[PDB]
Structure 1
Amino acid sequence: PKQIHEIKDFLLTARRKDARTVKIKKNKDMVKFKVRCSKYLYTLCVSDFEKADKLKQSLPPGLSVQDL
């Protein structure tokens, strides 16, 4: 498992053809965006809840989004 630090980088990996699904984990102090790729599970942490919603609707169509 690897951690993505930039939202821009997370979007780039979310558009990969091998990205099988994306899962949204909402903790009590941040939201984690996890994208399952061929080799690694990339995770992005977004402390600001409001800033996380904008990224949630910006994901490419056709990618399986799940809420945890």
Structure 2
Amino acid sequence: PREIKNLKEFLAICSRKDARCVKVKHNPKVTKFKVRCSRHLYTLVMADKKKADKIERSIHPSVKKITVTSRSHANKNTPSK
């Protein structure tokens, strides 16, 4: 995963042509925006809610993003009962 560091630079990524996926992580502080691209998951690390939102807003419709999320249930099963 390669980490991305300035907002603009990131925007270019989000439109990388490939840049499959992004994803939003929230933790205390912060929220990581993780982009799924080739060779890596290029990732820009967003603390700030204010800016965060706006940049989050900026998401071109086309944006694939999930936010980091909780117990999905892994979904294995054993095939009796």
Which position in structure 2 is the counterpart of 1:38?
Answer: 38
Residue identity opposite 1:26 in structure 2: H
Which position in structure 1 is the counterpart of 2:58?
Answer: 58
Q: Where in structure 1 are there 5+ consecutive unaligned residues?
A: none
CA distance in 1, matches of 2:63, 2:37: 12
TM-superposed CA distance for 1:59, in Å, is 1.9
Which position in structure 1 is the counterpart of 2:2?
Answer: 2
CA distance in 2, matches of 1:29, 1:16: 27
Root-mean-square deviation (CA), in Å? Answer: 1.0
| CA deviation vs aligned residue, 1:15-37 (integer Å, no higher than 9, x gap) | 01111111000111111100101
| Relative contact order higher in (CA < 8 Å, ≥ 6 apart) | 1
Q: Could you say which structure has the larger radius of gyration?
A: 2
Q: TM-score, normalised by structure 2?
A: 0.77
The alignment-based identity, stated in percent, is 47
Residue identity opposite 2:27 in structure 1: N
**Number of equivalences:** 68
CA distance in 2, matches of 1:46, 1:24: 9
1:24 equivalent to 2:24? Answer: yes
After TM superposition, the runs of 4+ consecutive aligned structure 1 residues lying more than 3 A away are none
Residue identity opposite 1:28 in structure 2: P
Which position in structure 2 is the counterpart of 1:14?
Answer: 14
